[PDB]
Amino acid sequence: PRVQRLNELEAKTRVKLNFLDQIAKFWELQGSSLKIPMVERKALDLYTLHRIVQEEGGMEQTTKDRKWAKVANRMQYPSSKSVGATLKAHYERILHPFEVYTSGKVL
């Protein structure tokens, strides 16, 4: 378990969340904790949260705007600079090594 938050299986929409299992195959030999979105909200929905960040302006431009506070308001987090920085750093470490794929395949 190694319990930080309440989680076990978690995948409401399986085929859409399976996109997170595709990138999990990229982090399988790294051992790094992937598929950890709603670190506060206790559940895990990176798919819909990734659409939110994109409609705010994408992870890169929303970092320049520093609107990660307001991205946290969209799913009703306790909107802190710390909470926004947790989501920011988590996107930075995961998408920037994997953008070798998303460069030509911008989904």
Curated annotation (Swiss-Prot):
Residue range from the parent sequence: 214 to 320 of 1838
Quaternary structure note: Interacts with Myc. Part of a complex containing Lid, Myc and Ash2.
Gene giving rise to this polypeptide: Kdm5
Cited function: Histone demethylase that specifically demethylates 'Lys-4' of histone H3, thereby playing a central role in histone code. Does not demethylate histone H3 'Lys-9', H3 'Lys-27', H3 'Lys-36', H3 'Lys-79' or H4 'Lys-20'. Specifically demethylates trimethylated H3 'Lys-4'. Required for the correct regulation of homeotic genes during development. Plays a role in the regulation of the circadian rhythm and in maintaining the normal periodicity of the circadian clock. Regulates the expression of clock-controlled genes including tim, per and cry.
Assigned protein family: Belongs to the JARID1 histone demethylase family.
Gene null: resulting phenotype: RNAi-mediated knockdown impairs habituation learning.
Lineage of origin: Eukaryota, Metazoa, Ecdysozoa, Arthropoda, Hexapoda
Cellular localization per UniProt: Nucleus
Protein name, UniProt field: Lysine-specific demethylase 5
Domain ARID: 13-103
